[PDB]
Amino acid sequence: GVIKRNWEYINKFDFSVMSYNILSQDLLEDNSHLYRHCRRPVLHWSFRFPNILKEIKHFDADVLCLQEVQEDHYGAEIRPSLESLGYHCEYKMRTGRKPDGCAICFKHSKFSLLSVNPVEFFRPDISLLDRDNVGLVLLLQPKIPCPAICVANTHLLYNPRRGDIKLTQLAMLLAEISSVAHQKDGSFCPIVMCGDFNSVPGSPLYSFIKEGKLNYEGLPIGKVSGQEQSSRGQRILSIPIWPPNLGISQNCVYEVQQVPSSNLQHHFSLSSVYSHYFPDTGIPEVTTCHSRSAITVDYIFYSAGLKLLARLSLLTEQDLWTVNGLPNENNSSDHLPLLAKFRLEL
Numbered sequence: 001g002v003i004k005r006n007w008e009y010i011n012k013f014d015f016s017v018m019s020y021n022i023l024s025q026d027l028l029e030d031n032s033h034l035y036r037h038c039r040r041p042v043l044h045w046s047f048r049f050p051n052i053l054k055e056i057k058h059f060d061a062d063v064l065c066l067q068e069v070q071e072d073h074y075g076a077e078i079r080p081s082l083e084s085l086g087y088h089c090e091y092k093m094r095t096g097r098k099p100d101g102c103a104i105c106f107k108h109s110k111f112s113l114l115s116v117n118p119v120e121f122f123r124p125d126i127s128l129l130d131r132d133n134v135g136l137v138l139l140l141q142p143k144i145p146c147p148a149i150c151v152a153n154t155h156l157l158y159n160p161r162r163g164d165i166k167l168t169q170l171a172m173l174l175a176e177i178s179s180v181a182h183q184k185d186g187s188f189c190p191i192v193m194c195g196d197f198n199s200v201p202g203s204p205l206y207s208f209i210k211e212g213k214l215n216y217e218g219l220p221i222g223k224v225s226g227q228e229q230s231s232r233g234q235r236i237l238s239i240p241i242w243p244p245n246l247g248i249s250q251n252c253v254y255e256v257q258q259v260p261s262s263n264l265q266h267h268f269s270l271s272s273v274y275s276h277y278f279p280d281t282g283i284p285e286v287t288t289c290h291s292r293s294a295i296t297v298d299y300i301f302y303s304a305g306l307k308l309l310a311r312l313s314l315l316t317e318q319d320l321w322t323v324n325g326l327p328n329e330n331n332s333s334d335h336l337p338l339l340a341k342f343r344l345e346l
């Protein structure tokens, strides 16, 4: 019963991607009921950050996609530490009362920056989109003597009930990617989309990402994410989910608004790095474990044209409770870092 995270291995450019919700100290302390299982000393930022930095240093990924990156801590400690490791860092803070956000970092030696494309999901003119969540999309040029790579990162709305907002937020991210990744030959460049989607494998939202299609007629708003909730007394998704003045089509691309079928679509071909279930046993993988939750909500998606060489295996709920849950004295987030090795064949 050994508890280990192994590397599963499945004219080129090779690069590794890490997706990691590092847990904002402010979000930690605002929700202390989630960490009742934890010994008090392991929760302090002074304890947690060195461990998190050690992980990042150890894995030495070419691209970092981080969530719950607290602004004050980012400026003071996280960004300087990452810059020292040879990373160029781009940040997008949430737009509300919560001063955390997403960062996409990449090694100077591996890429040049073509464009930075932040996405704010908050729209003051649209009542539906009243949440502070954000995304970030970079276009990177691999440094070799080659096509660009589009890297996206997000942290979608947590609230389990509001699947209408989740899907609209996702649509806004997909729309940005569609714009940035478009090439002169009319196809999309290779895409890596990381983040905390607050949605479980096999959920409608997850299915939408994988299939590029969703029939959402008669679907309760709470069922979208597959997060734990009653589902009683929930309203059904509207057709359309979001209003025309968002300027995004049902194919999740920007469109020219004109002065004035319940199926969502996107034009990408996306695979998930992780299978979500252990092959031998069929036990589900988890990416987050605390007092109230043990689920997968973190993903690395990629265009399948990249080839996945390897991934760092996840753990079961039972495995994580053997080490008394997350965070603990050895692992300093309530999430596990996702890690993938990719190959771009030229």
Ligand SMILES: Nc1ncnc2c1ncn2[C@@H]1O[C@H](CO)[C@@H](O)[C@H]1O
Binding pocket: 037, 290, 291, 292, 321, 322, 324, 325
């Ligand atoms: N919030 C929790 N959820 C699930 N299991 C827990 C929780 N807190 C402690 N445990 C574990 O459950 C068992 C309780 O005896 C122990 O193995 C302990 O680590």
Ligand SMILES: [K+]
Binding pocket: 098
């Ligand atoms: K929040």
Ligand SMILES: [K+]
Binding pocket: 233, 234, 235
């Ligand atoms: K409702």
Ligand SMILES: [K+]
Binding pocket: 321, 322, 323, 324
């Ligand atoms: K235990």
Ligand SMILES: [Mg+2]
Binding pocket: 021, 023, 027, 068
């Ligand atoms: Mg969290």
